[PDB]
Write a protein that binds this ligand. Structure first.
Ligand code: SRM
Ligand code: SRM
Ligand code: SRM
Ligand code: SRM
Ligand code: SF4
Ligand code: SF4
Ligand code: SF4
Ligand code: SF4
Ligand code: SF4
Ligand code: SF4
Ligand code: SF4
Ligand code: SF4
Ligand SMILES: O=N[O-]
Lengths: 417, 363, 363, 417
């Protein structure tokens, strides 16, 4: 047995990745000997053997990556070199290309086939579907194949451009929203595609202090984990009354325990049911979705729709893990999204001019404070930004908020104003 | 002539199944049939059946090709993936539902499931959002797809059925970079180190950019060498985050024996019933044990099996703790509280705790 | 001989009314009879009435002598003060209670009251804990005794009767040292500055130890100026805490036109029903306007009135807000939210939010 | 009038501090004119005059204090000098002396009259009953009178010592406890007296990096505000079942809404009332006092009593305001309180050794971590100490917790172990 540890992971009910890898090189090496235009046929097996050794050694066998991209773009290709790069010569390079995904990961078969032929010619055959950020991951290629491969993606009948990496606008992503879902408060997919197009430059050519991510969720259920995994989370919401179908409720309440499962679970006691009628107090609704989740045949999001902007989501490095906090309580979402774009560009001009090296936006706001952030985006402070007012009196005051005094004149006289 | 650039992804809108296209943003309701099949009824009366399968995330292009052969047979040459890396099929004629379910098992061996119904209040464990591990990443402490295949074997059951009282997300990251949903999942597996980096003075002068290496350290354990032109590491201040090693190849902290996972718990993303919450470490360290990682799998199951056994309908892991407290959580899950679990990550500002990390507010 | 030292306070047990000494640690129950009057019943059958009066805290020795005569006449020569500086007498003869209250009212002008009754759920406003202000302190932004006097004149009826639905503590600190309980009070008045220090180089040199003055600045606003052996302030980083002036007389920042008080709300110390809580700023600033401070008094009463009009029985200010939210709180109190109230005090560690700042836990 | 602004504050129903000042001035001037032995007859009126100028200028007229004390002590008197000493010489010096109060502010008239007699002779006649930390305040005397005043205090039939100030143990204080209170879980007055006398030297002779405050509360209602106002908060609690008299509950049940006022207000749902019997699930009780507070004739703290110690409570400066957090879930409080004294002395030795200039114990624990603190007091980590476990994986490990490895051998070989 070539792989007496990876082998024992081809066993069991859950579909094995090892069998996915074993299958690939088996079919790439068979292809090559059939005269097929394959440039890395030993792709997966190079990877297979390196993986078996790492299981033995319980350590990685990849070393730091030398900068290598495509022509004209700064990002989208993650380099990688194997520290066994001569024992296993075919893993000397095993670079990944991040490929931009169609909004909401929708595909026709045509689109995917065209993707497959390119990677089988220029890559290892191994992919990832999908990446956490959203992109399709083409897994394992060499320095002098990236450019031809991208010429080919870019000459496909259904073409694919590169995703983003490094210090740039990452590939935006969006939940299925209006494609399949009846809670969708706006067209998540259109917004995501539009944004991705508008800021192509910003995505392909890193110039920023660090990376900036965007995710679009159609309702507060947040099916793309936007608040946790993007710096700028656009979460669908509504302002008027939840729409209630009163006969529909009655149906539900023939069998479903509406009192324990809905009333007693609403976080603000906003929803009441007396056996006869369902009442919602919308002044007391925080729009958590639960009641609509429970009874989608009865309850709908209200008519006056748009989205809340949560700023600053990020993994812990350097200053701690962030679930984004309220930046813009409500914003309209209609094409070409100029209200959203004004925000985005103001934040980026400011972040580029003020940010440190590898400082995420969330961390700049923590550094510079919310008053500067709000001034930049031209919005007023709003109680909804905080869970509670400050627990200490150490407030800054604008010099113009101060009453003119002998002391203020003294400060001006000295040049301390 | 020059290569075409700055053209972006293809338009989702032309890549939409005809029934989905026509009825776009005009749906009436969904209705889970049974685990792995969601009924969707348009406003126009139209009915489409969405059927969900587990995928390894990592996929051969031949499996992608074979997923397309099934796709022309059962869903008109149309399919999507979900945000958790499952694959969904768009069936019209609802007899065909079962045949597809069979064929997919027959071809790629991908189980139907990963669904839940809020209405009923029966929930399935869905796929595990994970990272790259030893397959491609050069700063892992654990391997992603293996542990993922190992957990999903023992728990497999929960995926194919609806045997849980509330939603449960499991997530994995293979280092402190914490890619994926790992800082906000009901159960999280986070690769850690336990060993300070021994600087390689020869590599630092040649590769590393000293001031930004030192500046990358969250605890200030790093200080430049004036002589010498290297970096020294105050062992007393290092908590093995591995960040210095990201910025500088001459700062390895790998120790095959003292690398492992921490298990974290109690995260939440959705707003429903209770506000979003970051994950909390509840098990400081479990070893790497290729190939099954039995000890990692044990604690995960045992943390899950004890919440399942106690939680009221819709009561997710963090909501359960809201109810019992941490005293009772540790008892019931059979876990040990040690000093490692008292937070001492100094740099994070108290004021973040006062910000509203949530869309939940009143107009 | 040499002077006696290290002898300590006289032993309290020798200063206890004989009925209190006898029944020490053997009480059956207390019963609030009427505002200002609490009956205590021992297991022996002894009954003692504890009668409470409000005081201005600053007392003339001649007042103390007057209270002594009263105590000799009605409480056998024994009395006590409370932890909010009210004064209490101990009466065995219930037919004498009213003669006492009337004699105190008449001889020293101190009102009977300052009690509350959790049993019936009816509560008085007690005394305001406050500091020295301009009477003795060198770093005050506001006066203490004038403001307390002004506020108590306006809320007087709340002291003498049980008119509020839950406990309400009001406290005052004349600067951000916060010398008392402002940081954990239902309503707290806190003196602040709004202007940065102007370094006086000659005084800093003569009298200030520079490194410990520099380290007293919470924001890093201060740096040493080696060349001139003094300190420089970065006004962009200064938020006028005054801490550098506590350390160093060459760092004054007082400005009589911009010094003032912030109003904070929603602190809680007791465990009953809900965990203790730090007070939070809801009015950034009000000016000093001696002798009556009408703007400040007006806001304190506005806040208290809105709370008392909507609170349920037992629901103290922070609990009221737990129920309704800050959005409705700012609306019902007629207060404006501005950026000042968004917390930016960076030095405090987030992990403090994860420590258990309370004696509520399960065994 | 000489004081038209302060005269305003003789109006209104609340007792007036200005009348207290005026009464003192009038009667001190009258005693001195009767030939009584009064050294500062003009002290009170000069305070009055300077206060009136302060009300007009809206600022303090006191300057930064020089140092002053009694012979043999380095704490207990706060020097204070008026910036108006030439205009108003009678307040050139106006030091306060802090006088240690009896536990729970219990006095006899004989004790108070001795204090009035000495203060009339040596000082302004003005006092605070009491200073926030608990002390009697003697407000305003001259440097030359401090020592002779202290000598009289100590020679009284009921003598009084000076309290704490500076970087010392401050005067401990206590709630009335068992003297009057049926909820007391330990002898608050006795523990306070005992700590006061045990640590006289630490109190009278500051030696520490900053101040340290101890406060004694007989039960979780915390009527001395210990958790906010002392570094070391000793809070009475119990370990066993609440004691219930069922007849007395029924007595309450006849008029009180037990369900809405007790049952629904319990933080943990521990207490139930079904119209005939009350039940307390004591394993679910967090001993908040609410039910006992509500029904003191019916419910009592359990018999197995002691205290919880909360550490670190302080005002904001420098690192922020602290309500103390659980250090010691349960300790016994019995004379001579050796376990409490052991904890204290361990903390003070550590803190004296590691503390920075003006660092409070709270801040030191933040700086060094709870692991070091717990080792210092020889206690083990407990879940009751946190509200939640850490929200990040950046944990320190003891070197002895690590599995022996080639890497650990490498660290030893280099002297990094
Ligand atoms: C490709 C992907 C792995 C995966 O399969 O999940 C990935 C893997 C890497 N991430 Fe990431 N991150 C991936 C999504 C994430 C996410 C989640 C998301 O995007 O939705 C996070 C948390 C959200 C966030 O950004 O904070 C994430 C947080 C990080 C961290 C820490 C960021 C921080 O500020 O704390 C590093 C940042 C760094 O060092 O540059 C990082 C950087 C990296 C590097 C470039 C590390 C390196 O030095 O090589 C990774 C390359 C591995 C490789 O060769 O593929 N990655 N990373 C993920 C995206 C697939 C895609 O391109 O579509
Ligand atoms: C398929 C997918 C959308 C997509 O691919 O773009 C999805 C789809 C729906 N989600 Fe979700 N959610 C999807 C990711 C999520 C995830 C986000 C994530 O994990 O990355 C969660 C957030 C996890 C968290 O909160 O930590 C998520 C939070 C919810 C909520 C919250 C449940 C709760 O009680 O807290 C609802 C409620 C419900 O109906 O149960 C929900 C319900 C729904 C509904 C029912 C909406 C609807 O009206 O049709 C959709 C049907 C799924 C189902 O099984 O009932 N979905 N939604 C998601 C991919 C996951 C998968 O294939 O397994
Ligand atoms: C005399 C005094 C103790 C002392 O040693 O001097 C005292 C005495 C009592 N307290 Fe207290 N408390 C005293 C200051 C406090 C303070 C400390 C403070 O305010 O600075 C508080 C903590 C404040 C906080 O929570 O923010 C305090 C919080 C309580 C609680 C909680 C009320 C709540 O609902 O949260 C109880 C319970 C109750 O209401 O029955 C209480 C209950 C009591 C009881 C009823 C206990 C008993 O069984 O006899 C005593 C009679 C109070 C009454 O008027 O009904 N005592 N009590 C205190 C006098 C203050 C005054 O003159 O107004
Ligand atoms: C007299 C008293 C105010 C009052 O009239 O009630 C007081 C007055 C002073 N306090 Fe205080 N503090 C008084 C109790 C408190 C309390 C509450 C308590 O002890 O119950 C606190 C909050 C708890 C704490 O200590 O943190 C308190 C927190 C402070 C602060 C902040 C320390 C910190 O860590 O942030 C300062 C700052 C300092 O020490 O430099 C301070 C320092 C001062 C100074 C010494 C500063 C000064 O000289 O300007 C005060 C003397 C003024 C004077 O001339 O009389 N005082 N101080 C209180 C003590 C008299 C007594 O013996 O009973
Ligand atoms: S976020 Fe809302 S709209 Fe989007 S998929 Fe989830 S439930 Fe549907
Ligand atoms: S949406 Fe949420 S908060 Fe609003 S009523 Fe329904 S359940 Fe309650
Ligand atoms: S978490 Fe770390 S190891 Fe895992 S993929 Fe992300 S960067 Fe690589
Ligand atoms: S491992 Fe982390 S803590 Fe240690 S030196 Fe590197 S960056 Fe700093
Ligand atoms: S609060 Fe400030 S002003 Fe008032 S006594 Fe304390 S230190 Fe002086
Ligand atoms: S006043 Fe406060 S913030 Fe300003 S310089 Fe001094 S200490 Fe620093
Ligand atoms: S703390 Fe407890 S024992 Fe002390 S007075 Fe208050 S209620 Fe009584
Ligand atoms: S003491 Fe508090 S927690 Fe315990 S039963 Fe009574 S009310 Fe409930
Ligand atoms: O004397 N103030 O702690």
């Amino acid at each position: 047995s070539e792989t007496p540890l990876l082998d024992e992971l081809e066993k069991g009910p859950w579909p094995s990745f090892v069998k996915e890898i074993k299958k690939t090189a088996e079919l790439m090496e068979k292809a090559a000997a059939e005269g097929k235009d394959v440039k890395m046929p030993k792709g997966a097996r190079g990877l297979l053997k390196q993986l078996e050794i790492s299981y033995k050694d319980k350590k990685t066998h990849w070393k730091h990556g030398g900068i290598v991209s495509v022509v004209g773009y700064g990002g989208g290709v993650i380099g990688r070199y194997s520290d066994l790069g001569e024992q296993i010569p075919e893993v000397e390079h095993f670079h990944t290309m991040r490929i931009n995904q169609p909004s909401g990961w929708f595909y026709s078969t045509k689109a995917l086939r065209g993707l497959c032929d390119v990677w089988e010619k220029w890559g290892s055959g191994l992919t990832n579907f999908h990446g956490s950020t959203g992109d399709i991951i083409f897994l394992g290629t060499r320095s002098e194949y990236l450019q031809p491969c991208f010429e080919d993606l870019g000459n496909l009948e259904i073409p694919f451009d590169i995703g983003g990496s490094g210090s740039d606008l990452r590939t935006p992503s969006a939940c299925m929203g209006p494609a399949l879902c009846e809670f969708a408060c706006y067209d998540t997919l259109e917004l995501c595609y539009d944004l991705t197009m508008t800021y192509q430059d910003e995505l392909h050519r890193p110039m920023w202090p660090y990376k900036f991510k965007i995710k679009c969720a159609g309702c507060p259920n947040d099916c793309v984990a936007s608040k946790a995994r993007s710096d700028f989370a656009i979460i669908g919401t509504w302002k008027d009354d939840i729409k209630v179908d009163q006969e529909a409720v009655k149906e539900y309440a023939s069998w479903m325990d509406i009192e324990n499962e809905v009333v007693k679970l609403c976080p603000t006691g906003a929803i009441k049911w007396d056996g006869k009628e369902l009442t919602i107090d919308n002044r007391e609704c925080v729009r958590c979705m639960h009641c609509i989740n429970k009874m989608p045949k009865a309850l709908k999001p209200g008519d006056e729709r748009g989205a809340t902007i949560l700023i600053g989501g990020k993994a812990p490095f350097v200053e701690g893990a962030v679930i984004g906090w309220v930046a813009v309580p409500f914003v309209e979402v209609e094409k070409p999204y100029d209200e959203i774009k004004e925000i985005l560009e103001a934040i980026w001009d400011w972040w580029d001019e003020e940010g440190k090296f590898r400082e995420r936006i969330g961390e700049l706001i923590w550094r510079k404070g919310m008053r500067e952030f709000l001034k930049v985006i031209g919005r007023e402070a709003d109680v909804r930004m905080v869970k509670a007012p400050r627990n200490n009196p150490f407030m800054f005051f604008e010099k113009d908020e101060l009453k003119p005094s002998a002391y203020t004149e003294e400060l001006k006289k000295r040049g301390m104003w | 002539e020059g290569v075409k650039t700055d053209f972006g992804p293809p338009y989702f809108r032309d890549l939409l199944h005809p029934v989905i296209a026509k009825n776009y943003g005009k749906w009436k309701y969904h209705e889970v049939v049974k685990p792995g099949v969601i009924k969707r009824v348009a406003e126009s009366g139209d009915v489409i059946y969405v059927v969900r399968f587990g995928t390894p995330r990592l996929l051969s292009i031949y499996t992608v090709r074979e997923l397309c052969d099934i796709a022309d047979k059962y869903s008109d040459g149309y399919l999507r993936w979900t945000s958790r890396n499952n694959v969904e099929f768009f069936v019209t004629d609802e007899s065909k539902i079962d045949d597809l379910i069979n064929e997919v098992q027959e071809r790629v061996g991908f189980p139907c499931g990963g669904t839940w119904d809020a209405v009923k209040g029966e929930y399935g464990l869905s796929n595990i959002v994970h990272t790259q591990g030893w397959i491609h990443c050069h700063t892992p402490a654990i391997d992603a797809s293996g542990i993922v295949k190992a957990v999903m074997d023992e728990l497999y059951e929960y995926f194919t059925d609806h045997k849980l009282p509330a939603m449960c997300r499991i997530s994995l990251a293979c280092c402190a970079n914490m890619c994926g949903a790992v800082h906000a999942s009901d159960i999280a597996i986070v690769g850690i180190h336990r060993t300070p980096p021994i600087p390689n003075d020869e590599a630092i002068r040649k590769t590393c950019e000293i001031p930004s290496t030192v500046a990358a350290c969250p605890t200030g354990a790093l200080k430049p060498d004036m002589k010498n032109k290297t970096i020294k590491v105050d062992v007393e201040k290092c908590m093995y985050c591995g960040n210095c090693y990201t910025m500088c190849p001459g700062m390895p902290l790998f120790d095959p024996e003292n690398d492992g996972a921490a298990i974290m718990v109690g995260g939440k993303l959705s707003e429903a019933r209770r506000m979003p919450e970051l994950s909390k470490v509840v098990v400081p360290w479990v070893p790497n044990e290729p190939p099954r990682w039995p000890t990692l799998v044990k604690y995960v199951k045992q943390i899950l099996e004890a919440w399942a056994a106690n939680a009221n309908k819709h009561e997710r892991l963090i909501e359960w703790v809201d109810r019992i407290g941490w005293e009772r959580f540790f008892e019931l899950t059979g876990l040990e509280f040690t000093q490692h679990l008292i937070d001492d990550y100094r740099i994070t500002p108290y004021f973040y705790s006062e910000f509203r990390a949530s869309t939940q507010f009143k107009w």
